[PDB]
Structure formats: C-alpha cells, structure tokens
Amino acid sequence: DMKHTVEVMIPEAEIKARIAELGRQITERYKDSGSDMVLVGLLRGSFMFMADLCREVQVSHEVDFMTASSYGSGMSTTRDVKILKDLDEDIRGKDVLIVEDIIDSGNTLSKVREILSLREPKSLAICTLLDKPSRREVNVPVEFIGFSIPDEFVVGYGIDYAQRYRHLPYIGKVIL
Amino acid sequence: MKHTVEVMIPEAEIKARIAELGRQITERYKDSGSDMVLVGLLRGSFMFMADLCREVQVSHEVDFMTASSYGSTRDVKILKDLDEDIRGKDVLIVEDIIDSGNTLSKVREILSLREPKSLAICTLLDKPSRREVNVPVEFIGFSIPDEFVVGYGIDYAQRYRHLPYIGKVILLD
Amino acid sequence: DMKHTVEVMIPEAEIKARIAELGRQITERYKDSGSDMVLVGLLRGSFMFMADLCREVQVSHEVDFMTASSYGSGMSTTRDVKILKDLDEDIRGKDVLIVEDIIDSGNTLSKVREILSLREPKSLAICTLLDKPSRREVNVPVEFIGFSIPDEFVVGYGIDYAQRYRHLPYIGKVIL
Amino acid sequence: MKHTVEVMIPEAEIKARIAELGRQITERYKDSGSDMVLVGLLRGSFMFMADLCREVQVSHEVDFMTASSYGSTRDVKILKDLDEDIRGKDVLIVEDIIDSGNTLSKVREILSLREPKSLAICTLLDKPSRREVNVPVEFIGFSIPDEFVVGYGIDYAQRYRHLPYIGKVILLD
Numbered sequence A, C: 001d002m003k004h005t006v007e008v009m010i011p012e013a014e015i016k017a018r019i020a021e022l023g024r025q026i027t028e029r030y031k032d033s034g035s036d037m038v039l040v041g042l043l044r045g046s047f048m049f050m051a052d053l054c055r056e057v058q059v060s061h062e063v064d065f066m067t068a069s070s071y072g073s074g075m076s077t078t079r080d081v082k083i084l085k086d087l088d089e090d091i092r093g094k095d096v097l098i099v100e101d102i103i104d105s106g107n108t109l110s111k112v113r114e115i116l117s118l119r120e121p122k123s124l125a126i127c128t129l130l131d132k133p134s135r136r137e138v139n140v141p142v143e144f145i146g147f148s149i150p151d152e153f154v155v156g157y158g159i160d161y162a163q164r165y166r167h168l169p170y171i172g173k174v175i176l
Numbered sequence B, D: 001m002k003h004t005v006e007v008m009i010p011e012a013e014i015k016a017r018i019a020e021l022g023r024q025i026t027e028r029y030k031d032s033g034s035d036m037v038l039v040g041l042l043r044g045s046f047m048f049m050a051d052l053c054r055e056v057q058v059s060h061e062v063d064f065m066t067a068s069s070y071g072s073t074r075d076v077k078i079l080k081d082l083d084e085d086i087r088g089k090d091v092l093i094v095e096d097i098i099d100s101g102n103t104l105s106k107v108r109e110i111l112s113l114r115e116p117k118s119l120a121i122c123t124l125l126d127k128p129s130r131r132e133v134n135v136p137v138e139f140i141g142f143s144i145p146d147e148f149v150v151g152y153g154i155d156y157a158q159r160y161r162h163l164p165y166i167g168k169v170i171l172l173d
C-alpha cells in the first residue's frame, strides 16, 4: 500500500487487435484436430482474457477454470503449488489450451502444466496475454504470447495490484 | 439430440444493454464510499462479468464462487468460496441466467451471513416463468420467455459458452 | 516458535472414559429420531475426536467433514468465515451433530452453524471435546461438552501447536 | 438391496495390527531427520489415520486430501488439497483400501511433483486381485480376497463408517 499512479502500457484497442490475431493462430492450429478442445483459465487473473479470447477462437470448445495456490511473490518461491479449485471437467484425450494473464517467474504455471499433463490430454499448450521474460525463473514451454513486455509491474485486464484495477480495459503500469 | 443454433440476442444488443447496466450500477454505488466487489458465479458468468466490470466506472474488486450444480432438491454447497472478505462492502452478485432462482437464493443467504454493507444481484437473463423461490434482483439485462438459450457463457452439455451472442437451440425432427 | 514443554492435562484414559459417556448421551438423544443422522467434523482438528466418538455412538449414522477458513487467532477476529471444503453429502431433513475439538472464542464454529442451518436439517447440535469458556467471545449453543478447561493453550488429540502434536493420545498444555 | 453385516476382522485384531504397523513405520522414519507428515485420503481413511498416528512414535504432522470419487475412466481431480507443504518432507499416504489402485496411483503422482524427500503408502486393507495399475505399497495391514467389506471408515452407500471392526455385507435372497 504505497502512493502511485497508473500509466497506460497497452491501450484497449491494441489488446483487442492482438487477441484477434491470437484467435486466428489458435484457430488455425486446432481446426483439424477432430478431438474435443477446452480452454483452461487460471483464476482469477485470466477471466477477462479468457472471455475475449474464446470469442475469437473459431473452434468448438469448452471453457473451464482452475484456481492454483497464490501466496505472495516471495512465498510462491518456497511453497508447494496446490489446487484450490480443480477443473469441473475431464481433459483426457482433449486438446487443452491453458489461458494465462501474465507469465512473470512462471513457477506456478509450470507446476500447473505438470499436474494437467498427468491426466493425459491429447495435447497441452499455453497461451498467455503477457510475458515478462526478464523475470523468468523457470523454463516453461509457451506456445502463444500476446505481448513480451518490459520489467514493469502491470495492472488491468484481470491483473491486479493488491486486488485493485482488475476491471481496467487496458494494461497499465504502476508508477511509484 | 440433433440441433442447431440461431441468434436470439445479437452481440451488438448485448453490448449496448451492458453499457446501460454499467451506467445504472455506477450510479447506485458511486457515492457509497465503502469498498465494492463484483461476485461472479462460475462457470456461467465469466464472460458477462468480463464485459460488465469494464463498464462499471467505480473502483471495485472482482471475485468468484462455484456453487454445487446438479441440473434441473439437493443442498446448495460451496465448491469454491470467495478469495476475499466482503464484510462491510457493497456486493453485487453477477449472474448469467436467473431461472428457478434456487441456487442464487441460497448463495445470497450464505453471503448475507458475512454482513456486507449491501447485497444485490445483476443477471444478464431473467426467466420469470420458471421462478420457484422469490429472490430480489436489482439489475436485469433481458427478460425472456421460457426458451432454451445458449452462448455468452451459457452452455448446452458444456457446448457454446464461447458464442458472442445469446442463441436459441433448435431441436431437429 | 518458542522454547516450551508439554504437560499432561487430560490423560488418555480420562478422554476415553469421557467419550464413552458422551457416546451414551448422544445415543440416548437420537435413538428414536427415525430420521437419518450425520456427524459433521471440522477439519483438521476434530479427526481424532470424530473417529473415537462415532465408534461410541450406537446409532446408524453417516460421517462427513468440513474445512472452514482458519487464519491466525488475530485475523480470525476480522476475516469472513469461508468454506474451503464443503460437505460431501446433503443434510436437509437429517439430524446433524457438529463435532468440534475445542471451542475457544467460538467465532468460526458460530458461523459454520449458521451456514449449515440454511440447509434446513431436521436438527442441528454441537458436540465439542473441549470448551474454554473463559475465552468465549460469541454466544453459541453447545449441546455436548467433554471437558470445560482452564485458560491454557492445549495440544494433542488432533489439536496442534503450529502443526505440531496432533498425534498425541492425550490432551497436553504448552508451558513456555 | 436387503443385507446384514458379519464381523470379518475383529476390533481387537485391527488394534493389534495397527500397533505393529506403527512400530514398522516408526522404525523406517526414526533416523530421517526431516519433517514427517501423514496424509489421509478422505473420507475413508479418517478412522485409520486417528489410530495409526497415535502409534507412530515419531514427531509428525497430519494432513488430508479429498480426491474425486466416481465409484467403480474419469480424471482424478483434487476436491481438497493439502493444507501444508510437503517439499523435502517424509510423506506417508494413509489409505483404507487399495483395490484397483487408480485414484491412489494418480494422487501419488500429484504429490510426487512437489518433491518430498520420500513418498510411501500405508493401507489398512489390500485387495491384490482387483489391481489395475501397479502402485508401490510399503505398509499393508491386511491382504483380503475380493470381498465387499465395510466398517472402520469404509462405507456402503454412506453407511457403516462408524463400525469399530471390518465387516462383510451379506446380501439376502
């Protein structure tokens, strides 16, 4: 809780345009699979990205969600990744696309991929809106990236700052 | 069951209606002063929540619950509770369809125990005909007859959640 | 995490004897109900008490469990009581006995009773192994009490001290 | 289905067998030095856990999980995860019956990802005949034939969990 301002990093229109492209790419990849497809969102951060993204995915798919253990940025480095809420549906034999808002360290996401892989989906890929590779701690396969971004603390579009700013239609950055 | 899907409420009409809802919601809670939170019932309300919260011009938090779903006489149970506290906060439950009102009626009671400052419901679709339990609903996007609709988060055997419009399922025979 | 010792407060044999009595009383109360009965344990603390107690309850019943939000002793006074894991079964129209290890302030237990009451069981009662009334903050109906105890920090028999001592077969007290 | 319940494994034999199990478990982990935790799969293992941990003469934590149960080809899902971390700890999964081994096999894989120091399984009952997936089981209370048993945490349509013995259900006709 410290005095700050929020500057725009990615305007609403740019996000919309990029997600349209992501949609085309994801559609092109999975259109001929013939197996069931499901987009899996990591709550809470990816709810907005999921809503906009799945509307641009022109393939019959299911939408499902998952809540993994959060903790701080410092305790997440030393604590187990736990399932606070598992999927509602099966993914065995299905094309699964994990929908993430932002990959910073990539710790939690890495563990989540491992967990879902045990369920033997036909395929398992990740789509993140934002990637901050300067902050990457764990090597993790990421098939779709909306934006590779600077080393900034970002907010908006589902992403929060102490539970604040999730409803912003753009990606902003916190300036102390 | 062989079927098809026709547009009932176009994407453009949904967007317009939500913008209006956002203005109404903004107006009711603008001078509250207390923390505000929009609470979505998963999975159905995720898309409605995304668009709606972007039209609410009040600083608020977004949270989610998952209540037990059995289909069309069992206990309403919490599969996933809120992540944050709501005591002393303005709380708006965000729902996709109100039909029988059973689950939502119980979810409201459960949240009411936590003593929020206020507690209200916003639903995209309302089917007044199928109501079994009378539950107050302050904000309503559309009132429809007893039609089986899909899209915009609403599914049919897990299908069609990703449609940008509300559509009607036409059974073929 | 501070240097301490554990002294016995209620020896294993005394717990066994008292639970036998509790069993007789609970049996006498519910033997003629004719409706289904379920004992509901609040995890993790009441797992041992539940195992021993239900074996002394000579009435056909179901065993179910529930995990409510924990937090510290200081944050539990200002945070909502949340359901981390709800019951597996319905309780509507059933005789429900909530099985608790210890009632200190009684905050969390109070809220849990409220939540279960919404499901309209035929009856709803509470059985706690230990009651510490000197520390009671909220007035809550408690139908069965194993022991009313001094203002001591107790451990053992499911009850922990920073996750420690749950497996002790007796009730002990922490001495700094 | 009309039935009755006869004693198969008396309360006294269960107690004796568990005391022995406690000694074996105590011996294997006494000189480990790392934190130890017993992990029970709910609901079946709550009674077995209670008695077993009281016979384990090693300082340990007790925790629980609830995995998806569907009955006698779906994903194993976590309805309730551990409350505590297990990385670098000696972990003993405490189970009531091993039968097909399906759920337990998946639960072990999930916990294995968290990199505990060691990972083992203790089950009260083993039915080797019904095994579909080979999963290592270090400690076993009793090996039984393919019998439908109840009691000691094990249920039949939610019934008989509170029986202090293992019993067999006799169908009547």
Ligand SMILES: O=c1[nH]cnc2c1ncn2CC(COCP(=O)(O)O)COCP(=O)(O)O
Pocket: A070, A071, A072, A073, A102, A103, A104, A105, A106, A107, A108, A109, A152, A153, A154, A155, A159, A160, A161
């Ligand atoms: O710029 C950022 N903006 C808001 N959050 C960030 C940012 N960077 C890292 N975080 C924190 C987390 C998001 O979790 C938010 P929380 O659970 O509410 O504390 C990054 O996602 C997990 P990972 O680092 O493994 O990819």
Ligand SMILES: O=c1[nH]cnc2c1ncn2CC(COCP(=O)(O)O)COCP(=O)(O)O
Pocket: B042, B043, B044, B068, B069, B070, B071, B097, B098, B099, B100, B101, B102, B103, B104, B147, B148, B149, B150, B154, B155, B156
């Ligand atoms: O047209 C419809 N299309 C798809 N479903 C419908 C429709 N109509 C009623 N449903 C079923 C349900 C949605 O079920 C919630 P879920 O099982 O968690 O996905 C409406 O809830 C009744 P209410 O909110 O009044 O208690």
Ligand SMILES: O=c1[nH]cnc2c1ncn2CC(COCP(=O)(O)O)COCP(=O)(O)O
Pocket: C070, C071, C072, C073, C102, C103, C104, C105, C106, C107, C108, C109, C152, C153, C154, C155, C159, C160, C161
């Ligand atoms: O003597 C005591 N011994 C161990 N614990 C105690 C005692 N006293 C109060 N506690 C803490 C809590 C138990 O929670 C343990 P936690 O979630 O792991 O921190 C008392 O139960 C809740 P309430 O106070 O509302 O009846």
Ligand SMILES: O=c1[nH]cnc2c1ncn2CC(COCP(=O)(O)O)COCP(=O)(O)O
Pocket: D042, D043, D044, D068, D069, D070, D071, D097, D098, D099, D100, D101, D102, D103, D104, D147, D148, D149, D150, D154, D155, D156
């Ligand atoms: O004699 C039996 N009596 C009551 N049940 C039995 C028996 N035999 C196999 N079951 C069913 C199950 C118990 O189901 C766990 P739940 O649904 O969460 O309560 C044994 O699990 C098979 P495995 O552990 O090898 O994966």
Ligand SMILES: [Mg+2]
Pocket: A042, A043, A044, A045, A046, A101, A102
């Ligand atoms: Mg996130």
Ligand SMILES: [Mg+2]
Pocket: A160, A161, A162, A163
């Ligand atoms: Mg955060």
Ligand SMILES: [Mg+2]
Pocket: B041, B044, B045, B095, B096, B097
């Ligand atoms: Mg709904």
Ligand SMILES: [Mg+2]
Pocket: C042, C043, C044, C045, C046, C101, C102
């Ligand atoms: Mg407790």
Ligand SMILES: [Mg+2]
Pocket: C160, C161, C162, C163
């Ligand atoms: Mg504690």
Ligand SMILES: [Mg+2]
Pocket: D041, D044, D045, D095, D096, D097
């Ligand atoms: Mg089991």
